[model samples]
Target: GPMEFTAEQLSQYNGTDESKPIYVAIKGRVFDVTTGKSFYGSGGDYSMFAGKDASRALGKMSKNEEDVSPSLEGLTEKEINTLNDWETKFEAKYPVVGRVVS
Candidate 1:
């Protein structure tokens, strides 16, 4: 069973609230990374990506506030490729729970 959520809705699970599981999105697909909370949870190294579509940031290997978005606009081929690699690793390491909707 799959679920759909807007970027705003997905933002609710950003690991700040203990009630919800932490989620991270790549290429519009959301993964329940709650198991890796040490990396995505509060005060974690990658907390910036918690509950957000991190397509751009993952592609660019960036932690900039402006890059923590789902938009892939203007991404270079290398960046896109990088994101694909991340997506693959995510699929293998986490559970796909839903997707981000426009």
Candidate 2:
């Protein structure tokens, strides 16, 4: 089922304060509560801006998918292990953010 948040609650998300820590559904769809925009990302998580515009920054990053390829070009064993650990922890924390049910 789709999780829903009131527009009033969504309005509180300024995307400029980590202490506030943006809250998201992470369920079936993605929504940018700050700008009231929908994202193509798999999970429904809002970005923390901290006095900056998250919509602009995140939008640029999302549009530039080719940049990710060079980022993984040189990974040490420790780095790879750390990446795997982070992935495992992320999967555990956001279980509903999966692409497939089975």
Candidate 3:
């Protein structure tokens, strides 16, 4: 069954907990990306995205802490398109196990 998580709750699955799996969210949909541990796990490239809704960051293709937000407010057309692309890729490559909720 699909689970629902708050940002705080989702933060617990950020790959630091060896007993839990890693997760990434886009458009408020959560995906199990644990299989990509090398990339999303701690100390790996893009690890910042783990356990977070990376909508803005993925849209802008940014790695900055400021852009790690889930909001897409004021994003450019290209940025939104890029986020769409990222969501598509995530859908194709990962299992959608849950959703992020306020």
Candidate 4:
């Protein structure tokens, strides 16, 4: 369900002021290109706080003790394909956007 946008399209986003850091949305999730991952959850933790600030957020909630896994783990092939497709579309739309930066 991820959506795609070109760098130009992303750059055109003016919802926030220039001083505020811009966040890209794909499939309704925000991501920091620099980090190459989601921007508002646990960055690498196995909890709900993954890719996000840990101080005020609750980490992953699991009833099974052995289920400790990175938030990005277990992505289905379809999900990967969706991400890949989005990336391709993004590049195609913006052709000049450099590598993703944080």
Candidate 5:
């Protein structure tokens, strides 16, 4: 069974605390990104993504911290599709841990 998470709760599992799993969000669903810790851990290039819904960053292939938002406001159809595809990849590669309303 899955649980729900708030941003604060999400933060608790961002790999900063050794006891917690490393987690990230994409469109409010939490994903276990611990296995990809080199990229999701603190000081990693994608560390900015941990603990946040990063639909925009995945869509735009952007590493900009400003792009990591749950909202898809200005994304074009192609970008949304790209984001969806990335979401699919994540779903296959990561475990879904929880959800948030974004």
Candidate 6:
């Protein structure tokens, strides 16, 4: 029973409100990252990725504010590896709460 959410629905849990759970999208999976709110919360280094499908952004290691793409097209091998590593890291630490519907 995997939970599923639309892009807009997932955006609600961005750690903006303390009561709300924090989440982030990696590839097609949505992870509960509320435990690491220090780094993923608002104003944190990776805050830009909170609650969004930031696969390409993760792959490119780009914090340019415009790289939060969900596509894997044209990614370099290194980029893909980086993304895969993050995916593994997040998956290990967080529960698989849901999948992205977009």
Best by lDDT: 1
The estimated TM-scores of all candidates read 0.89, 0.27, 0.88, 0.30, 0.85, 0.84
Off by over 4 Å in 2: 1-70, 95-102
Candidate 1: residue 71 Cα off by (Å): 2.6
- Which ranking of candidates, highest TM-score first? 1, 3, 5, 6, 4, 2
lDDT of 4: 0.32
Model 3 has an lDDT value of 0.77
State how far residue 53 of model 2 sits from its true place (Å). 18
RMSD of each: 1.5, 11.8, 1.7, 12.2, 1.9, 1.8
Residues 1-102, model 2: lDDT tens digits: 444433334323434443343322221112333332222122234223211122222323332222222123443445446434433433355332212111
TM-score-superior candidate, 2 or 5: 5
Q: Model 6, which residues run further than 4 Å from truth?
A: none
lDDT of each: 0.78, 0.30, 0.77, 0.32, 0.74, 0.74
Tens-digit per-residue lDDT, 1-102, candidate 5: 478777678866656767677777776677888897788876675777877667778887785687677556665666678777778988889998787543
User: Which ten-residue region of model 1 has the weakest summed lDDT?
Assistant: 70-79
For model 2, where is the 10-residue window of minimal lDDT?
Answer: 50-59
Compared with the true structure, what per-residue lDDT tens digits does model 4 show for residues 1-102? 244433344433322333333334332233443232233222323123222211111122231223222223443445446444544543444232222222
Write one digit per residue (lDDT tens) for candidate 1, span 5-56: 6688778878878688888877888888889788888657668788787777
Backbone clash tally for model 5? 0
Residue 93 in candidate 5, Cα distance off native in Å? 0.9
The pairs that clash in candidate 3 are none
